[PDB]
Amino acid sequence: KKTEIPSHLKPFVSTQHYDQYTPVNHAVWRYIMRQNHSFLKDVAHPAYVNGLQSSGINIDAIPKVEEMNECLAPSGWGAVTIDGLIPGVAFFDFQGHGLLPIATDIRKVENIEYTPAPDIVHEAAGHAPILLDPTYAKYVKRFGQIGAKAFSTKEEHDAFEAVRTLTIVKESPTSTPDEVKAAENAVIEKQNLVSGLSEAEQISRLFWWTVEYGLIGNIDDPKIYGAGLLSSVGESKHCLTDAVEKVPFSIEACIGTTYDVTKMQPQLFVCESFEELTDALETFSKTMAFKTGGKEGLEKAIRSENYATAELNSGLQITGTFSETIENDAGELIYMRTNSPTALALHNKQLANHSTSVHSDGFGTPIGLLTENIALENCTDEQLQSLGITIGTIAEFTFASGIHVKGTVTDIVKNDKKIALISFIDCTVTYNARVLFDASWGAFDMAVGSQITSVFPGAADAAAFFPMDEEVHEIPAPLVLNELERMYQTVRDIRSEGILHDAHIDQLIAIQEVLNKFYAKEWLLRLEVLELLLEHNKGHETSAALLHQLSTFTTDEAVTRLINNGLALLP
Ligand SMILES: [Fe+3]
């Protein structure tokens, strides 16, 4: 059975259009994967070669994400297509559900060595292979669940929105250079306001030094598992040199080390085992608001200025933008409120009659034990009758804080044995002089709890809380393929047949003549023709000429390295 996509993450899911891959795109995939196989089979984690094949990824052509999804299903994993930049919490949430999110664009031939934007080479060929090791898949899935609970600052949310805006303007024909420059400046302004170390920044550093640039084994002879290294033979070769410091993995070093995506990594972190990473991630998770709860967790929710969920010891989950807290003389929290539409939930399921439409202007809740050391959450029906908490009865009780509640009880919502929500009408709630609830305001819904167990970003029932929009994407128009693309396709068609008859050899010589007359800088198609002739021991004169031309092709250092690496794989 295939891994299911949660309804809340369905809005981020797109479609891979295979017909948008040109013959050059398949050739670029093939060259990179052949180079990746040559070097990584000896220096990468042992799972890389069989893991790529078992993930549905082949060297000859770009992979289909739907095939990868079927291939990973026996491992309890899946693959989905995403279009454009998605929030970090969603990126991690997919992984927490055992789903690999893959952007399907491929890099241009001019950007084989470095792509400014991560492509299918990195997102499929880098992130999928080691998942075939169940210990690694366990770490990535657990990392996904923890990363989806990480709080970001309002400044980080603003910076992310501005970055998403720039990508839409930059990739649009209507946009002017000045319209782009403004979006570029908005990013610098928003990024400048970012300060401090959020849980999300720490999780981002941990993911980078493990899932992305991680090394495993003896520090003297480390093996590569990092997706960025598995997608870059150039970086993987440099990383194993003394030019890059190998440092033992630690949570402290990784969460405290910043990174630059533009330049090669100055240091890399070596783990002994995936079990070590999983244990360290769990130990780190205890510093996070989802595990801590309390005012410390709620403070992170307020700094986010974004939707968050507070879970009480009753199990009542409150989803909204938290805005204010009332603390006592000892700094202990006794009351909290939201300033936004709010929803209430039990067991990640929205309670009936407790949607955003009901709580449109905010939700306020006293938190603590009652007087006489009474935990209202664990109170029995008999104890509630003694307290006066019975439907149709005017209830009057005082919290240990001094918050005073008087109202006619309308409803009691229980979570199993525990009391979770007490609804009131004609209700007045007061703390000293301050009126926390006025009877003119109507219904008071009192969440029951003495402690805040967990604070996490987003919603407990995201499908109910958020609009699950079914976006419509237009199918892209069919590609028009020029002479060069057709020549690449012709070499691929001949290689697939596995026969090199006289007419096929004549076609290859015709292609070599077109390249000599009209395509002086075309090195990849020349390499593919040389590879094919050498494989079938045919066209001896054409092969010698192509080998000499490619060996002495250009003064350019990058292309020379790219050609020489291709020449190195020849029979
Ligand atoms: Fe990556």
Phi and psi at residue 79, in whole multiples of 5°? -135, 140
Beta strands in 48-193 (DSSP E): 78-82, 99-103
Distance 254 CA to ligand 1 centre (A): 16
Distance 571 CA to ligand 1 centre (A): 34
Please, which residues have CB within 8 angstroms of residue 184's CB and are 6 or more apart in sequence? 166
What is the topology classification, in CATH, of domain 20-153+196-287? Phenylalanine Hydroxylase (1.10.800)
Q: Quote the crossing angle between the two packed helices 23-43 and 524-535, to the nearest 10°.
A: 70
Closest CA to 124 of 58, 44, 25: 58
- State the Cα–Cα distance between residues 273 and 130, nearest whole angstrom: 13
Please, which residues have CB within 8 angstroms of residue 451's CB and are 6 or more apart in sequence? 293, 294, 312, 313, 367
Question: Which residue type is seen at 59?
Answer: I
Tell me, in Å, the resolution of the deposited structure. Answer: 2.3
Name the experimental technique.
X-ray
Distance of CA 472 to the CA centre of its chain: 22
Distance 126 CA to ligand 1 centre (A): 7
Listed in sequence order, the DSSP H helices in 118-176 are 120, 134-147, 154-170
Cα atoms found within 13 Å of the Cα of residue 62, Cβ hemisphere only: 26
Rg (CA), the chain: 30
Distance 538 CA to ligand 1 centre (A): 42
Are residues 209 and 249 in contact, defined by beta-carbon separation less than 8 angstroms?
yes
Paired with 430 in beta bridges are: 404, 435
- State the Cα–Cα distance between residues 361 and 367, nearest whole angstrom: 20
In degrees, rounded to 5, the angle at the alpha carbon of residue 441 between the alpha carbons of residues 447 and 422 is 25
Please, which residues have CB within 8 angstroms of residue 53's CB and are 6 or more apart in sequence? none
- Could you give the C-alpha distances from 425 to 13, 109, 209, 342, 398, in angstroms and in order? 44, 69, 55, 19, 17
Q: Residue 323 is inside which H or E element, if any?
A: strand 322-327
Are residues 317 and 311 in contact, defined by beta-carbon separation less than 8 angstroms?
yes
Binding site annotation covers 122?
A: yes
- State the Cα–Cα distance between residues 120 and 139, nearest whole angstrom: 22
Distance of CA 191 to the CA centre of its chain: 20
Q: Concatenated DSSP letters for 286-305? A: TTSHHHH-HHHHHHHHHHHT
Closest CA to 200 of 158, 166, 165, 157: 157
Are residues 78 and 98 in contact, defined by beta-carbon separation less than 8 angstroms?
yes
In the chain, where are the structural domains located? 20-153+196-287, 289-465, 483-568
Are residues 345 and 351 in contact, defined by beta-carbon separation less than 8 angstroms?
yes
- State the Cα–Cα distance between residues 549 and 551, nearest whole angstrom: 6
Instruction: Using DSSP, state whether 102 is helix, strand or coil.
Output: strand
Binding site annotation covers 305?
A: no
Distance 123 CA to ligand 1 centre (A): 6
Sign of CA dihedral 178, 180, 186, 191: negative
Binding site annotation covers 127?
A: yes
- State the Cα–Cα distance between residues 450 and 313, nearest whole angstrom: 7
Closest CA to 377 of 354, 349, 352, 346: 346
Neighbour-count burial of 195, counting CB atoms closer than 10 A to its CB (0-12 exposed, 13-18 middle, 19+ buried): exposed
Distance 445 CA to ligand 1 centre (A): 45
